[PDB]
Write a protein that binds this ligand. Structure first.
Ligand SMILES: Nc1ncnc2c1ncn2[C@@H]1O[C@H](COP(=O)(O)OP(=O)(O)O)[C@@H](O)[C@H]1O
Ligand SMILES: Nc1ncnc2c1ncn2[C@@H]1O[C@H](COP(=O)(O)OP(=O)(O)O)[C@@H](O)[C@H]1O
Ligand SMILES: Nc1ncnc2c1ncn2[C@@H]1O[C@H](COP(=O)(O)OP(=O)(O)O)[C@@H](O)[C@H]1O
Ligand SMILES: Cc1ncc(C[n+]2csc(CCOP(=O)(O)OP(=O)(O)O)c2C)c(N)n1
Ligand SMILES: Cc1ncc(C[n+]2csc(CCOP(=O)(O)OP(=O)(O)O)c2C)c(N)n1
Ligand SMILES: Cc1ncc(C[n+]2csc(CCOP(=O)(O)OP(=O)(O)O)c2C)c(N)n1
Ligand SMILES: [Cl-]
Ligand SMILES: [Cl-]
Ligand SMILES: [Cl-]
Ligand SMILES: [Cl-]
Ligand SMILES: [Mg+2]
Ligand SMILES: [Mg+2]
Ligand SMILES: [Mg+2]
Lengths: 539, 539, 539
């Protein structure tokens, strides 16, 4: 009778549960898993460090609604992968770390790479399991996948001893669960839907905030209809950008600080009152601000600031409830108020502030001058990976998104080291699209070796480094006796790393080079690296 | 009156406790800690990834007997550094990870990089503390330091909320403990000393195993005297190499398998019966092997295999006891026995096997041909960082050490990613010496960016890459449809990364290039990278 | 061929490793373990609550130097037993908690009493393991036992899934390790021994502190010799009482506060500078006290106060080193010093203060009057379980111990709930001796049901209750509208609980009852309960 190994069972089960992308580094005892994954049609990418690979797995979860898988060897391989668990935990992204473990009959002997891996994953996962036996592996795979995507999404860890992977059972002894179905999109009570709309009608300065929860829910159509029907001003969080196109006339992103400080009623659509929103507290918010909060996690309701109307459930379903109730009882915010006037004035004052910076041609160059030529060459449906400090914060302001889930950045954990991994994930999920990775020089160095990974798999990524010689800048000449802790080699020629795989690297210092270099670099058949020097005083 | 910040208190206490080397990446909230560490005379190295920096910290502990410090930001910074905690835990090396945390008065709010950092470090540390107040910081620093180096050495984690770092107290409020003394060197009972020597006199095929615990104990003088007085055959573990010079006539390294399989009594001097020694069990050991075990950890005694004589205490002190008892009652193993004859015959047969490989000039080249020329140009007091699979395992055989603590490799955890970090740690500890980094191509990619860190600090490191196109080898041409999980870009020109910082990169394919290229590379004032292609069949 | 279950294997291995006492409560799946333990000759005691049972296991470890075993069912049974693990952790006593677990093939299903038991035990154990297979069970038992008694003693947890317990293997597949030997008694370097005695000679006001680590080391004969040879004053910690007989002329126990405040050099013999010693800090100690510290734990050296001479190793062996060096170089503290004269003055005042209270016959009675008659009737070799607040702290003062390891109290963790369990442990280890349990009324209530356990097994235990109607005293009359949080029913007749098992209960309120009742109760063939009312203003 026919037999099958644990590795093959895991690969077949993962494929059945909708897993399509796997990132990691092979080695004892997970070599057969990557091989069986390739034969099952799962796309496997061999990275240079599991850290970057584990970040890629979480980004796949955000982009597709099914967990990406990070495959790691026992011990230090799994521990490197904890970075991606924690990032997925922080952003509530579906993600599975699969870590090898030493053979179970060697526990307690000081086996090769013996480590407490379950306990190391526990703080950051919704689910951690070591399968008891080979025949029950599909049980744990299905339960892990379902746990990552049902409820508030998050991370799972599977601990596979080497003898579970390499052992075999009779195929007739293995039961496979059906593919985990899409999670149920739960709805708010009818009274909360009505109380939320009634509350909006009493507000003098209302504001909608569209966060990456709305983007993960795939709610862009419902959100856009809700914002347009109500005529409400809206603000997109960094990764909420593009749920509504960033050029929409009701966006007040250029008046963000004014809007947050003066709004009296905010509608949080899949966004938390966490550090990114200044906890919804003074001085950045008004002391008496009223909150309508839409979130799949009931425990998030009322964090930091009380919530007047709680809308617990799926953002797509709940926003459809609001649009349906607005169909029965139409209402819109007026086009001319003192609120719109003040918002429109601040937007105009901001345009006056940034225009001299956008057209500043002095050398060394500023952020705005460089991001202007980058922005004007990105395809409209390209996916942008944007990572750094000022590179990423100004990048958020200058680089628009016109579709949902097309910006990947440092997100809630503020992580450096996600840039190349998230770009590789985006390229894997969207093979037909252009991927633009825009990183600060420090951010680039966290996962720089993965440019070769992008070349090896033929990924349509272009790497742009905005280089000010360090973390928020570094001197033009290093004094060997006093190297600042956050400085790097002045004018480090990172673009030379393209020569590792036969790609093209460009070194840019003057504004006249920007457009012809960025154009020729984006048309390259291999990933190009564009290294753009900027002033260490720019900001 | 005069005041002082938490960051300055921590830097001063660390310096008082004998900390000399700090590796990490700055950012909120640890920016002032690196600044104050430099003002106290602590050498701070800004890395490209905290993963590599945390590995450097553990290597410093091994090399110096005082913990190296890894400095990481809150959240993902600290989580990246968990790699170093686990490596230090695996090797019992003294090491401190200092992790920033969010301001304490923002706990529970979703603060920037809020994370359960103590619980993340817990599985791998002997000590984890969040200092309760600024004034007590020196209490925690001394307790952390003392705990890493007393008893079985291990890792510590210090959790520093931003307001503990940035807040101030009056200088007269702070008490600084004295410098933590050297740990007391404990002795074995005198009857155990006599029983051990008595047991040795009954053995027909005795063997000494010199492990890195003897190296860490700084026991080289007593261990060499003990082996020479007794005339016993000895086997050095990978990082035990050099405790006795590797050209010593009593080394049976080239007959290792024969020695372990047939010995009837082994003396473990700071070495574990773990996976490296195949658990001391059949078939690689004899079923009835008798064990004299010398370890500072009483709990380690009798793991896997029963121990006949337990010598619990410090290796230097216990070996001095053995030498003093041999001085009162002399004894030595006879220089002509059938045991010696078999060992000598196996060593000679091994020399006949490897001589053709050492002199094989065929292209693409093999490991032995390449390592032969590396070996002959390495200074005798150089420090070797050797990392990979066959690159490291063959490197252990071919590259000799003549002094203790001059080899750093993947060690007990089998970690890829330590190579450059441990090389940088070695250069920091021994600035007067040449550091040779010999890695496989895959190993090099785990932290290849750190070659720029080596250049930025002017470290005397030469990076040698032994490149077979992947993990255990990769094909000469990649099939875009079928990319092997462990392959990299064929003939990837990693030496081009030397151009990032203005160094010299060399690409070697034939034996005639080896000697002049390695000679010119080692004499470079900046770190050179030598990329050496070998066959993917070799190993 | 002959087969054997996992339960029978575990019972056989525990017996081979020196385990002689098992306490717990049976149920799925540990029922076969208790039965097999009885057939092996292990004494099994069925308690009424795993909490009390787990406290008995730790006490067995302290008394015998081999771990007592607590046997608990899966889930809440094991969780109840964590109390004992934490107490053993706090006191560094060897103990094993053996917890059942649900069948491994039901993991993830919501099985009966499925719970994360290893992670629940982790913070308090030196060792936690789920055996991977039935045939390797003896490996884990020996490793667990060895880990509890080697090094600094502590607790271990064995997680046993029901299918490991109930399954069977062929006896020829099971290898049993040899009995774990007594750990080696490690020595301090000879220069530290000389340094300690040399520092002793420079002291103006030297003091010896004898802790329960010296008692656990079985070092009483060496400690008594050292103290008598040097003529030094000594203080016995609560459970260090009896190491030297409490009526020894050199005891300064009655001048404890004066001695700690004025000593300029203390010899700590198995005793910590923890909360019990007020951290060795002012105002209770002198700011400049010098410390000679003798402890098996290197990490304990130098906690809170610097240590001038560290003596790391076994108390018995190291004290014998001190006595041997005092034989080569005799020294003794002079008579007629102001130190001894000041101490004897303080001792005489204390004796004069308490003698009125010893003879005060007023009703309600006081602590000293009651404990005077208890003291005058306890056999010299009896074992005293003394628990509560004032009942225990004054009991420490009034009830002397003449042999080592004859006082069990709340110890380092200050735990209520240990009294009856530790009395049952003591009766199990020393069946030939009288056990006296002297508890406060609140302390008695924690484990009161276990008086039936003592009667069921014919244990020679007398239960004395000192009753002041609550935690540190409650009112004479309870108003139902305002019941104090720490008060109990006034004059609660706990002695009526002897009638549950057909024993004798006594209720005592006047001094003329004390002697007749106590004499009658101690001669009972079943455990008697003496409920002694005392004033709530006493103490
Ligand atoms: N399907 C869904 N429907 C509604 N809310 C969701 C859904 N999935 C996740 N969320 C919530 O969206 C929120 C996203 O918040 P956050 O990550 O802070 O967004 P941003 O960073 O864009 O402000 C999380 O609190 C999460 O619980
Ligand atoms: N000062 C010391 N004296 C004696 N033994 C020590 C000392 N420090 C550490 N050790 C022990 O040395 C052992 C080294 O074992 P291991 O790392 O397996 O060596 P190797 O890998 O070289 O065989 C550890 O068990 C550790 O407890
Ligand atoms: N065999 C031994 N020899 C010496 N010290 C020991 C031994 N076993 C345990 N100890 C130590 O004895 C100390 C007991 O301290 P503690 O419990 O505070 O005593 P006490 O409460 O009586 O003051 C612990 O620090 C422990 O490490
Ligand atoms: C894992 C991790 N380590 C460190 C940090 C701290 N940090 C925040 S931004 C940054 C780099 C900023 O420099 P760069 O990417 O060059 O951007 P710039 O601001 O100079 O444009 C670092 C190290 C972090 N957020 N995450
Ligand atoms: C953190 C970590 N990830 C993965 C592995 C698995 N592993 C062991 S050796 C190795 C690299 C082997 O390739 P290379 O360095 O080129 O050496 P070669 O054997 O080809 O000479 C890898 C990835 C590991 N040990 N540690
Ligand atoms: C597990 C636990 N719960 C609670 C306490 C708090 N506590 C300390 S002493 C004590 C009892 C005091 O009353 P009693 O035993 O009657 O003694 P008395 O002082 O009245 O003589 C209690 C509950 C504790 N130490 N441990
Ligand atoms: Cl979260
Ligand atoms: Cl040197
Ligand atoms: Cl403790
Ligand atoms: Cl005391
Ligand atoms: Mg920068
Ligand atoms: Mg290779
Ligand atoms: Mg009471």
């Amino acid at each position: 009778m026919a037999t099958i190994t644990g590795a093959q069972i895991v690969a077949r089960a993962l494929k059945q549960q909708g897993v399509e992308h796997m990132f990691g580094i092979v080695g004892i005892p997970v070599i057969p898993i990557a091989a069986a994954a390739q034969r099952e049609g799962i796309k496997f990418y061999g990275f240079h460090n599991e850290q970057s690979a584990s970040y890629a797995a979480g980004a796949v979860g955000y982009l597709t609604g099914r967990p990406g898988v990070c495959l790691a060897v026992s011990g230090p391989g799994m521990i490197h992968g904890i970075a991606g668990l924690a990032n997925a935990w922080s952003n509530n992204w579906p993600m599975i770390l699969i870590g090898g473990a030493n053979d179970s009959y060697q526990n307690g002997q000081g086996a090769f790479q013996e480590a407490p891996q379950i306990e190391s994953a526990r703080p950051y996962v919704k689910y951690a399991a070591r399968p008891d036996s080979i025949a029950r592996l599909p049980f744990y795979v299905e339960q892990a996948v379902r746990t990552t995507i049902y409820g508030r999404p998050g991370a799972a860890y599977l601990d596979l001893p080497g003898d579970i992977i390499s052992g075999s059972v009779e195929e007739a002894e293995v039961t496979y669960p059906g593919r985990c179905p899409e999670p149920p999109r739960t709805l708010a009570p009818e009274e909360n839907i009505k109380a939320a709309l009634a509350a909006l009608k009493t507000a003098e300065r209302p504001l909608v905030i569209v966060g990456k929860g709305a983007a993960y829910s795939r709610a862009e159509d419902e959100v856009r209809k809700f914002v347009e029907t109500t005529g409400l001003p809206y603000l997109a969080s960094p990764m909420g950008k593009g749920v509504i196109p960033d050029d929409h006339p009701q966006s007040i992103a250029a008046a963000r600080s004014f809007a947050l400080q003066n709004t009296d009623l905010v509608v949080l659509m899949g966004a938390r009152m966490n550090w990114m929103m200044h906890f919804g507290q003074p001085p950045r918010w008004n002391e008496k601000v009223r909150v309508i909060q839409m979130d799949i996690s009931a425990e998030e309701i009322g964090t930091n600031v009380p919530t007047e109307v709680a809308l617990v459930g799926d953002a797509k379903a709940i926003t459809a409830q609001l649009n349906a109730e607005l169909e029965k009882n139409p209402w819109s915010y007026p086009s001319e108020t003192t609120w719109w006037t003040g918002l429109q004035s601040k937007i105009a004052a901001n345009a006056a502030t940034v225009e001299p910076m956008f057209n500043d041609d002095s050398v060394p160059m500023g952020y705005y001058r460089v991001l202007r030529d980058i922005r004007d060459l990105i395809p409209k449906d390209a996916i942008i990976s944007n990572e750094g400090a000022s590179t990423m914060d100004i990048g958020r302001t200058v680089l628009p998104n016109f579709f949902a889930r097309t910006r990947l950045d440092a997100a809630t954990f503020g992580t450096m080291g996600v840039g190349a991994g998230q770009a590789i994930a985006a390229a894997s999920v969207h093979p037909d699209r252009k991927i633009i990775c825009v990183q600060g020089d420090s951010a680039f160095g966290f996962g720089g070796m993965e440019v070769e990974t992008a070349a090896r798999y033929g990924l349509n990524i272009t790497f742009v480094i905005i280089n000010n010689n360090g973390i928020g800048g570094g001197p033009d000449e290093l004094d060997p006796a006093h190297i600042p802790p956050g400085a790097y080699t002045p004018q480090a020629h990172y673009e030379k790393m393209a020569d590792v795989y036969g790609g093209k690297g460009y070194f840019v210092t003057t504004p006249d080079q920007l457009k012809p270099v960025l154009e020729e670099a984006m048309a390259q058949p291999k990933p190009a690296i564009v290294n753009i020097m900027i002033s260490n005083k720019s900001g």
